[PDB]
Amino acid sequence: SESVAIIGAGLVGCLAALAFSKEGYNVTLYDFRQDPRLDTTNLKSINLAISARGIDALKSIDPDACEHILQDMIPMKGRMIHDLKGRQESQLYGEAINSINRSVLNNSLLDELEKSTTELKFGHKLVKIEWTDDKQICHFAITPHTEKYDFVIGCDGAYSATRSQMQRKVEMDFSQEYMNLRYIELYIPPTEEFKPNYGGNFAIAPDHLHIWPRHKFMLIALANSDGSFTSTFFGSKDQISDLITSKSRVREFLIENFPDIINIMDLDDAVKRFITYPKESLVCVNCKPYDVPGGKAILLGDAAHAMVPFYGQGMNCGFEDVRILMALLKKHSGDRSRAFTEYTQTRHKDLVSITELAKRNYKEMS
């Protein structure tokens, strides 16, 4: 019965914590942010698209809770393209995706954890790790604090501190790249009345991923359960910077480029969101290997392969990481040293393809 320190209570980390509690490991999930469920309190997006692969990975870890967690997801049967004239054209789907709320999926995973042996330590920032040949010494900041574990699993985001600590122990080929891409989260409220055709209070087609393809920028919309739409604008930081110098400049920009949103969105609210948007940069990372030899550490999710939003699906990719790691662990009879090794040897070549294609689709647009 071994113990594991999982650094990062995000979607990937919480899932890994669930899959390691399922197998019998004494899991201890950490995160420097407070409990997201707590009212007194880190959402990069209101919702996201989960693929069949991301769903199958959910089932492989908990078939029961899966259909309970994903009970509010909305399937997309294709893309709905809005042109400059405001005309909509449907483009049916290769791989099916479903819209699901991020905070709900995150909280649901957390709830399933507290219904198990695992232990949740929020407000614990990992600062340092020392590597022995038996147990790893994890230093936190909450006020110094230290606990020892058999192995540490990093799921602490693109700026992974776990990754940095691993680099002091292993020769890691590592590359980080900051993109010009920026995103602004907008909101399309539900209609006042139920719409028979859409099957809810939706201003537009709920079973479609709406896209407003423009030159070097983009608007998208995913349906929420309550009828509203989570909307996201994608563009370079330069374009946005030039826009937000004037409320009228932003307002006239939206009307000109997305004329068919005037009936479904308050422009004054979108202008406000544009100007006061968190100017947070997007970074892409690649690692090799993802594991410390001896099976003492491993990287999953954005910590290992952070990629471009929309063009790449990081959550689905992160979920697939966990499922493959479990297949290997249950193929090598719990031998983490041999399982973590085969992970890198097989997962890296897939991740190289995925991240590059996503990066290639992005550079194409911009």
Ligand SMILES: Cc1cc2nc3c(=O)[nH]c(=O)nc-3n(C[C@H](O)[C@H](O)[C@H](O)COP(=O)(O)OP(=O)(O)OC[C@H]3O[C@@H](n4cnc5c(N)ncnc54)[C@H](O)[C@@H]3O)c2cc1C
């Ligand atoms: C706008 C947007 C839209 C997206 N849409 C999709 C989509 O539709 N489909 C899809 O598959 N993906 C999508 N993604 C990507 C997806 O959100 C991420 O790839 C996914 O959340 C990865 O989760 P993670 O747990 O690996 O990293 P994170 O979500 O960042 O989790 C890391 C956690 O670790 C914690 N942490 C950080 N540092 C420390 C530390 N030093 N000590 C302790 N804890 C720490 C943080 O608090 C954080 O909660 C989107 C991303 C963005 C930005």
